[PDB]
Design a protein around this ligand. Sequence first.
Ligand SMILES: [Mg+2]
Ligand code: NA
Length: 353
Amino acid sequence: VQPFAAQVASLADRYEESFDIGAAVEPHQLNGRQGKVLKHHYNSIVAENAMKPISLQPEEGVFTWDGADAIVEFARKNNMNLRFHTLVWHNQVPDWFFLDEEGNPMVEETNEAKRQANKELLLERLETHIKTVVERYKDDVTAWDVVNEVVDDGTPERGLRESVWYQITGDEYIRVAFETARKYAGEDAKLFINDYNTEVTPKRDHLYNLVQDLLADGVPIDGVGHQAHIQIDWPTIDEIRTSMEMFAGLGLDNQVTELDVSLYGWPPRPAFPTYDAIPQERFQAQADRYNQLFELYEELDADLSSVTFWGIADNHTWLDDRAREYNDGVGKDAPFVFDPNYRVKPAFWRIID
Ligand SMILES: [Mg+2]
Ligand code: NA
């Protein structure tokens, strides 16, 4: 019988001299023993979904603040830091951004000069969206994911992701997003570029050259968010260390923003059907990995300000959707230090020590 997580020592207190300890949350997870476990173990939170562009501005000029407000309210109640995820992304972003005035998709425009019109129109919509979102939460947010996932995985030229944003504006939306965010959040606000697989080449190198570029042009960036959607055996600790040291070497702060330690490889196949189908030895392999990982975080704590998990406990993780995707609709992952009943797992004991 592993104990309920309210009966164990605080992760946040354990790491207070090194970095914040954060969780992604939905608004329905903010009371009960969920809320109690949150208050006790975390001193930072982020919205898993409620602050994404489609959750905030689903139609032009139409802002839906209720979910994000609840999260903002919760962090304030419990004296927690707050990350904003995210001002710019290529998913969970409303379609109206990318349509011209006649209502046709900007990406299908073949007239080069009409494409320049579409560049300017889109950038002003971006600017307006950031301006409005940032105004409301400027006093509460402690770190902004200004752009998310703007670097691509392969292509060893520049390696920028050719989402709709890039197809329409090239790299200019990245510049505008950071410059707008600075103007409205304040000179002290901490502006992040956030991404997954930052640990491995060439993606690592593409992200490095992109932030190097933006810093060269006076674009205000303060840190790199490492999503750290990682596995048990990959990437190596030295790849993680090299990655964070490399971005620190550009005068950037590092944050670990979306940490989950999947029980599977990539792709996550074959998968366990239920949580209680998972053998105990996998939980011990996950704990071993967590230990090495947090020993590295502590080692790098001069350049690492916050470590946020992409969830609370194993009852709710986006990795189930990925497991289900590659295993014919059936599959459970288990990436956290707390299990589906909010009981501690072996990994908890290995990072609380
Ligand atoms: Mg340990
Ligand atoms: Na630190």
